[PDB]
Design an enzyme around this catalytic site. Structure first.
Site, PDB file in Angstrom:
ATOM      1  N   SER B 127       0.850  -1.200   0.000  1.00  0.00           N
ATOM      2  CA  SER B 127       0.000   0.000   0.000  1.00  0.00           C
ATOM      3  C   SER B 127       0.873   1.233   0.000  1.00  0.00           C
ATOM      4  O   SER B 127       1.763   1.361   0.838  1.00  0.00           O
ATOM      5  CB  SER B 127      -0.948  -0.004   1.202  1.00  0.00           C
ATOM      6  OG  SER B 127      -1.652  -1.238   1.243  1.00  0.00           O
ATOM      7  N   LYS B 153      -1.378  -1.034  -4.293  1.00  0.00           N
ATOM      8  CA  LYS B 153      -2.500  -0.172  -3.926  1.00  0.00           C
ATOM      9  C   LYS B 153      -2.040   1.277  -3.850  1.00  0.00           C
ATOM     10  O   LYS B 153      -1.084   1.575  -3.140  1.00  0.00           O
ATOM     11  CB  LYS B 153      -3.062  -0.584  -2.570  1.00  0.00           C
ATOM     12  CG  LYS B 153      -4.135   0.337  -2.040  1.00  0.00           C
ATOM     13  CD  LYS B 153      -4.290   0.195  -0.521  1.00  0.00           C
ATOM     14  CE  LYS B 153      -4.509  -1.273  -0.118  1.00  0.00           C
ATOM     15  NZ  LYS B 153      -4.415  -1.463   1.379  1.00  0.00           N
ATOM     16  N   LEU B 154      -2.710   2.174  -4.569  1.00  0.00           N
ATOM     17  CA  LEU B 154      -2.417   3.612  -4.446  1.00  0.00           C
ATOM     18  C   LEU B 154      -3.494   4.324  -3.624  1.00  0.00           C
ATOM     19  O   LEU B 154      -4.684   4.212  -3.924  1.00  0.00           O
ATOM     20  CB  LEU B 154      -2.349   4.279  -5.825  1.00  0.00           C
ATOM     21  CG  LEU B 154      -1.360   3.716  -6.846  1.00  0.00           C
ATOM     22  CD1 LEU B 154      -1.514   4.482  -8.160  1.00  0.00           C
ATOM     23  CD2 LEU B 154       0.104   3.732  -6.329  1.00  0.00           C
ATOM     24  N   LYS B 155      -3.093   5.028  -2.571  1.00  0.00           N
ATOM     25  CA  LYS B 155      -4.006   6.001  -1.984  1.00  0.00           C
ATOM     26  C   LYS B 155      -4.257   7.135  -2.977  1.00  0.00           C
ATOM     27  O   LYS B 155      -3.332   7.622  -3.655  1.00  0.00           O
ATOM     28  CB  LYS B 155      -3.491   6.579  -0.663  1.00  0.00           C
ATOM     29  CG  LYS B 155      -4.554   7.444   0.042  1.00  0.00           C
ATOM     30  CD  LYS B 155      -4.321   7.473   1.554  1.00  0.00           C
ATOM     31  CE  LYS B 155      -4.980   8.685   2.241  1.00  0.00           C
ATOM     32  NZ  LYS B 155      -4.561   8.760   3.694  1.00  0.00           N
ATOM     33  N   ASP B 180      -7.184   3.055  -3.070  1.00  0.00           N
ATOM     34  CA  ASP B 180      -7.906   3.182  -1.816  1.00  0.00           C
ATOM     35  C   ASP B 180      -8.459   4.596  -1.824  1.00  0.00           C
ATOM     36  O   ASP B 180      -7.705   5.564  -1.721  1.00  0.00           O
ATOM     37  CB  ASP B 180      -6.936   2.973  -0.648  1.00  0.00           C
ATOM     38  CG  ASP B 180      -7.612   3.055   0.723  1.00  0.00           C
ATOM     39  OD1 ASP B 180      -8.823   3.346   0.839  1.00  0.00           O
ATOM     40  OD2 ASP B 180      -6.906   2.801   1.711  1.00  0.00           O
ATOM     41  N   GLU B 205     -11.400   0.978  -3.592  1.00  0.00           N
ATOM     42  CA  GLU B 205     -11.842   0.635  -2.242  1.00  0.00           C
ATOM     43  C   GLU B 205     -12.626   1.751  -1.554  1.00  0.00           C
ATOM     44  O   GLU B 205     -12.142   2.883  -1.451  1.00  0.00           O
ATOM     45  CB  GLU B 205     -10.634   0.218  -1.384  1.00  0.00           C
ATOM     46  CG  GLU B 205     -11.017  -0.456  -0.116  1.00  0.00           C
ATOM     47  CD  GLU B 205      -9.823  -0.765   0.784  1.00  0.00           C
ATOM     48  OE1 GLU B 205      -8.694  -0.929   0.262  1.00  0.00           O
ATOM     49  OE2 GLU B 205     -10.044  -0.811   2.032  1.00  0.00           O
ATOM     50  N   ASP B 230     -15.040  -2.054   2.434  1.00  0.00           N
ATOM     51  CA  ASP B 230     -14.235  -2.299   3.617  1.00  0.00           C
ATOM     52  C   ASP B 230     -15.120  -2.109   4.847  1.00  0.00           C
ATOM     53  O   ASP B 230     -15.752  -3.051   5.305  1.00  0.00           O
ATOM     54  CB  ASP B 230     -13.001  -1.373   3.584  1.00  0.00           C
ATOM     55  CG  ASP B 230     -12.130  -1.468   4.838  1.00  0.00           C
ATOM     56  OD1 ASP B 230     -11.130  -0.702   4.923  1.00  0.00           O
ATOM     57  OD2 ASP B 230     -12.436  -2.278   5.737  1.00  0.00           O
ATOM     58  N   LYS B 254     -11.375  -7.889   6.944  1.00  0.00           N
ATOM     59  CA  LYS B 254     -10.575  -7.703   8.153  1.00  0.00           C
ATOM     60  C   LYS B 254     -11.214  -8.532   9.244  1.00  0.00           C
ATOM     61  O   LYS B 254     -12.386  -8.341   9.587  1.00  0.00           O
ATOM     62  CB  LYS B 254     -10.515  -6.207   8.543  1.00  0.00           C
ATOM     63  CG  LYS B 254      -9.588  -5.387   7.639  1.00  0.00           C
ATOM     64  CD  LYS B 254      -9.730  -3.868   7.845  1.00  0.00           C
ATOM     65  CE  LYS B 254      -8.934  -3.164   6.751  1.00  0.00           C
ATOM     66  NZ  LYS B 254      -8.716  -1.704   6.981  1.00  0.00           N
ATOM     67  N   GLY B 282      -5.356  -5.044   6.369  1.00  0.00           N
ATOM     68  CA  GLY B 282      -4.371  -4.935   7.432  1.00  0.00           C
ATOM     69  C   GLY B 282      -4.721  -3.775   8.324  1.00  0.00           C
ATOM     70  O   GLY B 282      -5.426  -2.846   7.901  1.00  0.00           O
TER      71      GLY B 282
END
EC number: 5.1.1.-
Lengths: 360, 360, 360, 360
Positions: B127, B153-155, B180, B205, B230, B254, B282
């Protein structure tokens, strides 16, 4: 730790009915214990599509060669090893469920416990045939109501459906009552089936085609009584599609029909996620199949009584040593590791018609 | 057989990051073994609604008195004993996951085995936070691709979304790329988010509100990039609802958010029955939570990479004796019974803020 | 003009029931007046997800530090200052509602007036438990009908639902009657719940899961009685999604459940925009909470009677000086600025179990 | 406490534009203060259905006799006193908005504060008429971008739509661009309007019939550019219906069109509960209407810029003592109680066409 499957016996019993019912058994050997499962396929494809000849050939020619001499972490790994063959879920179940029994026994733990169940007994009902008439029906139901069975299930057809139900319902307005419509109906029968709504049946089981979901979803829109599916749910994904479609509000979960215990837990959990109960169907099993059923029925979404009635109702003598008898509509969980039951080998030998052993 | 829970410790640690992170642990003792779990609630309600003060009060005042001195068949029976209380899934997960660890250790069996997994390694993704510009984003992706991660994963955030995704996809036509969106968007943003479609992202996400499914369903009709949920999936029925509504096609699972391993496996199985993958999210866990995550990630419908990357990335020194280090995008399952990891009590004692012990 | 919050007291009272109920109070001080609100969260998460330990820690550690020493235009600015923390709406409400009381008092204006209400009294009903049987029920309802309460609400469960209602309805065919189904049902209960339709209940309150909307929308399609939502509407956006889905036709509006007065007005206005009434729920409040409820209930879409019955029904002595008594099912609005009620400080001191003061 | 409305003046002014514009004003007197509002109906029914003759007859013959000499708690109580009459929302708004101003001034509190706002400035956009060609359009946009406006609106019409939008977006890739389609289109135009999609417009305003929601919903399915409703949202339930039908994702909110500030705040709150923004429309108001608009625009879901630009753009000299002048796209909230602006009575008298005074 892990378990090696060293040997497998296929033993086919012919058990006289209290004429006869064929009981195909798989025994898997490993780590000094054994797992036993019972096939629920028939010699002819009458309830569903598999047959004993088909299934046994699949076991000896494909599934057994894949697992013999192999070591596995769990029953899930055994199932994975069988490969991408299509259908034949009851054949698969014989291997998968025997593997569950074996795995549980290597640990010394009850099968229900590993499946996540924590009941000490399960609620049970009975399923009856078509009676000669309204009175005969009411009388024979009374026999089972006086035994404390927690649900009465009547066979129906056209045009013997409203009559039995209306009769039984007046005699017994408080009992839990359902019908097995036995796929004897088509969408053209919606109006008649609707006449059953007044009698507050818990559900109408599999009224339309054994393999259908779409028409059932349509029929459900037309009547108020919930539909229960049996034959048309052979997997967790079937259960999802059925419940999303609105094909039924209840599932009759038969462990071998869906391919065994792990898939059955998934079916059970999918139904629960949709707010739909399940209940344990019956396939006239010997005490092997009956004990697998009882252990699976310990799961919390088995919220309606199952067709898992007393063994002594079916057989003058069962294939296992332990009795499986319900009292007051409650069937206790057989104690011990795995299924908690034990083949009566001497008695089994007297009714064996085929036997074979397979090794690596 | 059954296990009696004799005692419980709550240990709160303040673990130095590679500033500090507060790590709440519950240890359950019984049958000569111990089960350990890690709380994922924070001091303030930022990721979701629970807090350390609420959770710990709930444990010591409610959950622990309900189970101490009691005998249970399995972790499902433990959870059942707390069933009356509403929400608080992460507090619940502390007990439930500790129970799984304890139970597994009474049998001497790895946790993943009892949940139905048979993988020896799990695939891991990385991430990336928001970088200064396009080329700084691309250089960082280049590093992580070279380290062998199996998903990037890119914010992203309003004003910085299409640009980093465009630059990344141009440099890397074929990698598995995800973003994300961190609940930072609204329905007014649909046209902007649709601009991501040509870059073939595996999913976006939780772009809209943290507790929403309905508006996500609407957004999924307006763009072709899959949505991944999520925070709004905290149970198996939430999973069913999200997938049936078409709120997304992927779930960031999660374990603590949904109340533990049993319900997590139900979420996993519901998703699978819809043909939708899950992956393991995570929560910056110490080795305790990270090892629970790895065991759960062994299940077959964890078909996209999980945020269970190397512990050394987060901690100078972890709370467990065992290193959890991924190599080439693969995290090995830590060997041993239950979670297969072991608290380093002397090191733990050096970073312990508060501890307490409870008995019946 | 604007108001500076100079100090805040948290005072926790233990009030004996006519055993005890815990009353968490927030008092905010500024500009020579004070605002008082009452927390409706419980020591344990039984009605919903918050707890006193969680909420108070959130107040002292987060919300109070954010506002103390700060100057605000209105209660909306106070709420804005609390930040983007997730959930915890009843904790937020303590601050928000105390701010409303304080703001109103700086102006010398009744709270209801600033909220846009112009009633001098509000209609009220009562909610009763499960009675031993059909007669006991009818008798105890008669007691409240002879007091002029404008709606009678019965607790129900399976299978004690149709009986109480049929009985009460025959004795009283003209009364306004409803049930609180207490989340004791699942979709599998639709047919039974439908049996209630003949008795013309105004609504069935929260029959399914406390956090659900989707299943309620499905159940609403199957029965003719309107569904009322309580626990599952914690915001104006929840109310929108519920009403758009068809999850209910009525909302039980609890002011603190939704995060305070301003959000409650928004909930009220959203319900109105959909042609759905609201009514004021009760949480066994002391006269502080009860007075906030009465002021909010002055809004025009409170078109069904609220659970806001006489204080003397609950407490042998209340925490405020003024009586709050309904006669003939009409509760008058307590006169004065803000809530129009006043802590009885001497009496409160005798039942205080915790007290603390906070300043900038 | 409460306010008594002692007297009312209707003043009709003919205010010179930077030809003339007829400005109807209502002044309400009570408690030593006055409230002022401005009518937005025209002499002929061109923007909507109301006219100056109808509205003024309704005021002097119906609304004013209903309130003169009466005592009210709040503006909501004032509106209630007129509730029997159908439509005529702008006539109603004259009374209701004057009541807000009066009420606020009895308390000495800015209007925005009592409506729940806490902004000190509001963002403003500019509206461009149809220009001769592409480059004349672009040059005019360039001017207004340089003056700092936060949104650009282009008038468009069949034959002149894609061209000015294309030319503008090419010159300005990142500005907030919108169009006003002025009910000039039909469903046959869907393919042409879809050609706007690639230019990422924030919205297209009311392209189809002025009183329609249903056909707009259909058009919104055929193109990806958001639709913004104007004339067809005249109440909070109209807002709910538009958003729920998917007739648009944005509302041009005009305070007088919907019947005043209370209903405008309900529209604002309904939109917000759907996650849809509102913005403040303009009606070439004198300083009176413009100041009401600015106070309303302080609410939090006014998240796109409003047509409350500098008064000097419209008037040689305004009717109020205070200048309302935006700088860099920001309009300050005029300071003071209620609207914070003050009629210049001597200047007003010089442009007064007709005036009258009413008492009980």
């Amino acid at each position: 730790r892990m378990f090696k499957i060293e040997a497998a016996e296929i033993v086919v019993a012919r058990l006289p009915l209290k004429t006869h019912k064929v009981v195909p058994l798989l025994i898997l050997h490993g780590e000094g214990v054994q797992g036993v499962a019972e096939g629920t396929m028939e010699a002819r494809p009458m309830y569903r599509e598999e047959t004993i000849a088909g299934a046994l050939d699949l076991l000896r020619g494909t599934f057994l060669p894949a697992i013999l001499g192999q070591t596995f972490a769990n029953p899930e790994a055994v199932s994975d090893a069988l490969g991408s063959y299509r259908g034949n879920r009851m054949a698969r179940a014989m291997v998968e469920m025997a593997a569950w029994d074996l795995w549980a026994r290597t640990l010394g733990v009850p099968l229900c416990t590993l499946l996540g169940g924590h009941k000490e007994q399960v609620e049970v009902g009975v399923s009856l045939g078509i009676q000669a008439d309204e009175q005969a029906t009411v009388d024979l139901v009374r026999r089972h109501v006086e035994q404390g069975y927690r649900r009465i299930k009547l066979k129906i057809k056209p045009g013997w459906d409203v009559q039995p139900v209306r009769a039984t319902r007046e005699a017994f307005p408080d009992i839990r009552l359902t019908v097995d419509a036995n796929s004897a109906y088509t969408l053209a029968d919606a109006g008649r089936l609707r006449q059953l709504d007044e009698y507050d049946l818990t559900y109408i089981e599999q009224p339309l085609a054994w393999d259908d979901l779409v028409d059932h979803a349509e029929l459900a829109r037309r009547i108020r009584t919930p539909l229960c599916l049996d034959e048309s749910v052979a997997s967790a994904s079937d259960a999802r599609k059925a419940l999303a479609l609105g094909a039924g509000g209840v599932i009759n979960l038969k462990v071998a029909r869906v391919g065994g215990h792990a898939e059955s837990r998934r079916v059970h959990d999918v139904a629960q996620s949709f707010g739909a109960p399940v209940w344990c169907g019956g396939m006239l099993e010997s005490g092997i199949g009956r004990a697998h059923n009882i252990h699976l029925s310990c799961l919390s979404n088995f919220r309606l009584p199952g067709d898992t009635s007393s063994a002594s109702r079916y057989w003058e003598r069962d294939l296992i040593q332990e009795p499986l008898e319900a009292v007051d509509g409650l069937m206790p969980v057989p104690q011990g590791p795995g299924t908690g039951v034990t083949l009566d080998r001497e008695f089994l030998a007297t009714v064996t018609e085929a036997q074979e052993e397979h090794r690596a």
